[PDB]
Amino acid sequence: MVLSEGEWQLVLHVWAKVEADVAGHGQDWLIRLFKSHPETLEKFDRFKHLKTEAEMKASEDLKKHGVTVLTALGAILKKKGHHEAELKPLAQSHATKHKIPIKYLEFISEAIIHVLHSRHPGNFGADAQGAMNKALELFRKDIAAKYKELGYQG
Numbered sequence: 001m002v003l004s005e006g007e008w009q010l011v012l013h014v015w016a017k018v019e020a021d022v023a024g025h026g027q028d029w030l031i032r033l034f035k036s037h038p039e040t041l042e043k044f045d046r047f048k049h050l051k052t053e054a055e056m057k058a059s060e061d062l063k064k065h066g067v068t069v070l071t072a073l074g075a076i077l078k079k080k081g082h083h084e085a086e087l088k089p090l091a092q093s094h095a096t097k098h099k100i101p102i103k104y105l106e107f108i109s110e111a112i113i114h115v116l117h118s119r120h121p122g123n124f125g126a127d128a129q130g131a132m133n134k135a136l137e138l139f140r141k142d143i144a145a146k147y148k149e150l151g152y153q154g
């Protein structure tokens with residue numbers, strides 16, 4: 001898969017707006033994921049005790065992890081496809097330590113797209129969503145290939 005420069009520009013233009021509020025977007029993403037696919041919460045021993053959205057919103061720890069997740073994804077997107085080095089440690093920890101199936105990476109992709117559509121309607125029209133979806137599909141394709149090399153089905 002290869003995105004054109006035009007597609008990367010649509011992706012990075014909305015990401016520039018996302019970076020004006022890293023903590024807010026990171027939190028919104030994880031909460032949307034947990035609300036839409038509750039089974040994903042079970043993978044986090046650190047957060048699985050949270051019972052309601054209100055408890056999730058109030059968790060400083062969950063906000064801190066959201067910042068970590070968003071910042072890591074941002075570093076990969078800014079590479080515009082040349083992200084092999086960034087992907088290795090992430091594939092290794094998620095395949096071997098956390099044991100995150102590819103299906104859950106699809107769910108988190110859906111959650112980021114939903115939050116960007118809600119917060120940035122003017123910069124996240126059809127073409128921009130199409131470009132972001134292609135960028136996340138590329139990320140998932142490459143992570144899946146690494147999972148296979150590492151011995152995890154995903």
Ligand code: HEM
Nearest residue numbers: 040043044046068069072073090093094098100104105108
């Ligand atoms: C956009 C995709 C994702 C990114 C960029 C991402 C990034 C990260 C990063 C940077 C860390 C900390 C370092 C590490 O352990 O590798 C981490 C930890 C973790 N990730 Fe992810 N992750 C992603 C998706 C997921 C998904 C979908 C799940 C589960 C449904 C998940 C579960 C975990 C868990 C359980 C930890 C350890 C949390 C803790 O107890 O500290 N990750 N992830």
